[PDB]
Amino acid sequence: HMKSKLPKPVQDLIKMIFDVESMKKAMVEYEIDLQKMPLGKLSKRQIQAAYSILSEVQQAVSQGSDSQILDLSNRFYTLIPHDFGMKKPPLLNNADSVQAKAEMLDNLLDIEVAYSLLRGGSDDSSKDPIDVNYEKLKTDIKVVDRDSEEAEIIRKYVKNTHATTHNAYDLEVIDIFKIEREGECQRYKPFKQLHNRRLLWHGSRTTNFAGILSQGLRIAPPEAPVTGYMFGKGIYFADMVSKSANYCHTSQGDPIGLILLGEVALGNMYELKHASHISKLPKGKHSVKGLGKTTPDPSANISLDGVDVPLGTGISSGVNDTSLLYNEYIVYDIAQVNLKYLLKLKFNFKT
Numbered sequence: 479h480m481k482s483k484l485p486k487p488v489q490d491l492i493k494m495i496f497d498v499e500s501m502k503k504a505m506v507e508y509e510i511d512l513q514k515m516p517l518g519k520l521s522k523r524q525i526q527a528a529y530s531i532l533s534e535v536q537q538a539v540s541q542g543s544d545s546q547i548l549d550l551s552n553r554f555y556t557l558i559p560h561d562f563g564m565k566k567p568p569l570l571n572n573a574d575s576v577q578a579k580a581e582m583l584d585n586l587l588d589i590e591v592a593y594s595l596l597r598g599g600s601d602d603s604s605k606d607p608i609d610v611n612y613e614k615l616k617t618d619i620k621v622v623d624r625d626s627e628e629a630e631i632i633r634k635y636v637k638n639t640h641a642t643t644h645n646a647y648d649l650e651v652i653d654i655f656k657i658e659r660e661g662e663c664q665r666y667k668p669f670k671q672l673h674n675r676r677l678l679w680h681g682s683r684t685t686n687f688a689g690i691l692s693q694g695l696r697i698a699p700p701e702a703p704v705t706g707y708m709f710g711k712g713i714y715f716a717d718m719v720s721k722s723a724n725y726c727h728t729s730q731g732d733p734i735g736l737i738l739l740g741e742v743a744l745g746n747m748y749e750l751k752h753a754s755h756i757s758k759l760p761k762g763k764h765s766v767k768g769l770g771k772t773t774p775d776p777s778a779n780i781s782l783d784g785v786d787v788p789l790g791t792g793i794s795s796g797v798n799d800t801s802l803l804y805n806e807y808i809v810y811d812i813a814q815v816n817l818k819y820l821l822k823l824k825f826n827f828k829t
């Protein structure tokens with residue numbers, strides 16, 4: 479084939495995110511039986527139906543029996559086959575079970591998008607599959623120059639906001655990409671001048687990124703159990719890089735991760751200390767801020783293309799009896815996010 483003119487960093491990004499074996503590896507990490515639910519038999523209606531049963535399990539837990547729970551639990555495993563041999567699988571009888579399974583289904587949604595791009599489309603041997611898969615993302619991806627100002631600011635954001643409690647690893651930035659999802663700037667127009675626009679982190683596993691770049695960061699569907707998400711069903715960001723980087727789920731056996739920086743239109747924040755599984759914001763609010771005990775030093779906020787970058791070292795916020803060690807930001811309308819960068823990260827595990 480004609481060999482692809484894309485920058486090498488862009489080619490390795492495309493290799494990573496469309497890797498079929500990585501998708502499978504993620505699935506067996508969630509204890510899915512690939513013999514019964516292979517990557518190709520995954521579909522949206524199966525994932526949604528599973529979400530609903532998980533909403534049934536949520537209902538039965540909120541009103542307290544291991545007798546009547548058993549039936550709902552089994553119905554879940556019926557829709558998403560798990561790898562337990564001749565079994566009796568573990569009972570899904572608590573809030574932790576619901577959170578953990580909702581998170582798995584979130585990932586399956588993104589994996590199904592990635593695989594549907596791969597199996598949709600055309601076959602032409604004379605094109606480099608790298609170029610072919612790139613086009614499927616409908617996302618302009620450029621390499622940001624190491625010596626630019628934007629690169630310096632980004633590396634400082636990474637350098638300054640790694641929490642002491644996440645010190646089992648550190649981060650080097652391998653590549654910085656500037657990204658522009660088709661139509662996202664247009665979608666963002668209503669919020670582009672809103673106050674309190676902040677450049678924030680969103681980490682995810684590499685097997686979700688094809689989904690993210692083609693479909694954007696998204697709201698979990700109606701069927702998903704609201705109780706599975708600490709501040710309900712929205713799009714979550716952090717101001718501490720390590721808090722987001724934990725969601726990459728890197729390890730000693732695959733240490734390269736991907737993390738986003740999005741411009742988030744937060745406006746009037748509904749400030750919370752503890753879990754609130756809301757399905758709408760109070761009138762007049764545009765976002766939830768989950769209040770951390772620690773925050774980037776607000777005096778070291780810097781501006782990048784008119785957007786605040788909270789890149790100060792972590793200090794005490796002053797908030798007292800909070801569930802959150804660090805800040806968290808949630809929006810509930812997809813149009814409040816404009817994705818700006820994508821970093822490839824090297825994780826040095828010190829353990």
Ligand SMILES: CCCN1CCN(C(=O)c2cc(Cn3c(=O)[nH]c(=O)c4ccccc43)ccc2F)CC1=O
Pocket residue numbers: 584585587588679680681682694695696697698699707710711712713714715716721722723725806807
């Ligand atoms: C439903 C499609 C896939 N999906 C999964 C849900 N989602 C989220 O942003 C989300 C993400 C998380 C977990 N999470 C996360 O995965 N990455 C983060 O950087 C993060 C930062 C602060 C708090 C949570 C974070 C929890 C609940 C969520 F709703 C956006 C999203 O598009």
